[PDB]
Ligand binder design. Sequence first.
Ligand SMILES: O=c1ccn([C@@H]2O[C@H](COP(=O)(O)OP(=O)(O)O)[C@@H](O)[C@H]2O)c(=O)[nH]1
Ligand SMILES: O=P(O)(O)OC[C@@H]1O[C@@H](O)[C@H](O)[C@H](O)[C@H]1O
Ligand SMILES: OC[C@H]1O[C@H](O)[C@H](O)[C@@H](O)[C@@H]1O
Lengths: 590, 32
Amino acid sequence: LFEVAWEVANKVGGIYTVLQTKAKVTGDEWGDNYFLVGPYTEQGVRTQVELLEAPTPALKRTLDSMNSKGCKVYFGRWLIEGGPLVVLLDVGASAWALERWKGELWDTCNIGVPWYDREANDAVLFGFLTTWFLGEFLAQSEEKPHVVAHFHEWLAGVGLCLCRARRLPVATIFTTHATLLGRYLCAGAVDFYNNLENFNVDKEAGERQIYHRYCMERAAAHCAHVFTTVSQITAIEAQHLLKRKPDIVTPNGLNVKKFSAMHEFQNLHAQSKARIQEFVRGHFYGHLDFNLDKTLYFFIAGRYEFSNKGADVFLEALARLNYLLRVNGSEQTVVAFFIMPARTNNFNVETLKGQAVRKQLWDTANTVKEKFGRKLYESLLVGSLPDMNKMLDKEDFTMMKRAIFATQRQSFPPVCTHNMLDDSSDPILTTIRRIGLFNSSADRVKVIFHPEFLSSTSPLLPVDYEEFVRGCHLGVFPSYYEPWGYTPAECTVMGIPSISTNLSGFGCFMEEHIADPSAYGIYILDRRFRSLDDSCSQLTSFLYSFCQQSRRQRIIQRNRTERLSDLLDWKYLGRYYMSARHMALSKAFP
Amino acid sequence: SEERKERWEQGQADYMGADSFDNIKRKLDTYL
Ligand SMILES: O=c1ccn([C@@H]2O[C@H](COP(=O)(O)OP(=O)(O)O)[C@@H](O)[C@H]2O)c(=O)[nH]1
Ligand SMILES: O=P(O)(O)OC[C@@H]1O[C@@H](O)[C@H](O)[C@H](O)[C@H]1O
Ligand SMILES: OC[C@H]1O[C@H](O)[C@H](O)[C@@H](O)[C@@H]1O
């Protein structure tokens, strides 16, 4: 098996997660005949990969057959023990002969990549290197086994045509997880779901680009022995646009972390929410005028797509929910996070300063705490109950007064934790300042935009993504166009209720698998049969309905949402890959 | 036809002329 892809060592939301979750089961069920191919980027990928430059059995012949011939191929383990013997390929090591590879592409399939975008050039170069490695392996192994080559996305789709030109006896499977042409039309301010058969692919390809990419994608789909897509909705645009109906639907699964107790995810949520509460206390210093027990943490994560990931409708719903909470005289407050990576330069002074003063207050309270504890210990040793007024003197009251005065703040807490280099052109900040949300005292919702992926080694918010998601209360992902949707998937795996859409692969998958959804925390939101304003109103209604329920109802809802983890497990969802491999073997050679 | 090669190298290809997916469709069947 060869699961060649571009995201194996570099962290990107797509491809990387599905491969990392699949590797364990796909290796334990099959064995050491599982091989993974990907690129090399000088970004720290070697930190997570245990490279094996020295010769190693289980395809030891290529190391002394081709490595010392002007190429660069490594063998790694990934630090994940699913037996993922990964074949890492360097991109910049072999780039001096791009002209001959372009000529080879011209001879074979009249395709290639223009010099405008280096991403696709690197993808094609990696495809050439992968094809050379696979051919060398077949030559060295005397063609005794019939290996199956599987391809993900267009970043590794040139392998299909390269192998078909050379007629290598392998079973070809191609699985596209996102028709990028659909992605770039859905961002073109044009309706995409009302009609699909009225699109002219060649006319649209090129004004927004995606002409060579579309051509190579369709060539791979046609020439691949087995074609596959993520959701049933994915197959719909695949057969209507690429004119190649997928052989079988292959829903995306996850490696659920089973605990010895059913309620351990609740404890993880409690701890992570405590950490988020510490961050909130840091950010809203001098403005802690709202109860923190009535605070709910909403969030929308993923790549920074405004109209595709559904951030405009979420912000409109947040403004409306703020208006209803203000006019209803409610003590509930909602802190909404926005984890969408936009380029910054560093943090702003306000956020780091807020964390600093929060922990300075923590230190001052600690000091008074040890002094009080020592005096109380003396009193208990003597045998007299404290009268509570003889312990604290004038100096510690003086320093508490000084600390309180130092934390006084007149400006409002910032909406962005980082210092972005383009604030006049950022959609999120623009609409935030348009809808009049500035974390004010009167505001019932507080927006925090964290334009960066979460990491466990960050100066502020020392939580990785999974822990932070476990800490939140509701994940709102009203995405207009996205094939499957991972973020709601692990939200429901970790027990957090989520707001999906009927235009999403996750929402569609959970639509017909459960009778009466939204009773299990899956607030499916209709975006196909409703206008934008109606969808915003429905999102506001869903948010308010989540707000009105008490703590017991929230706990019960989280339990019900967690109970659905078995649907997205790779044990249940891995059978489709096995079926695809069986069809590929039957088509190529029994 | 090096003219087509240079033209597509520039990145601005035609659609109703000699550059279309019809040629790819007609040549892909020879590879399977
Ligand atoms: O701060 C973040 C936000 C998102 N993700 C990852 O990004 C993926 C989101 O994938 P999805 O299919 O939702 O959309 P994509 O970002 O791939 O377009 C999830 O698997 C998350 O694990 C992450 O690692 N850190
Ligand atoms: O954050 P809430 O919705 O109020 O949930 C409250 C917390 O939920 C879970 O983490 C645990 O059951 C905690 O014991 C509980 O205090
Ligand atoms: O469909 C699988 C997932 O990965 C894809 O590459 C897309 O980035 C994402 O939106 C999709 O949900």
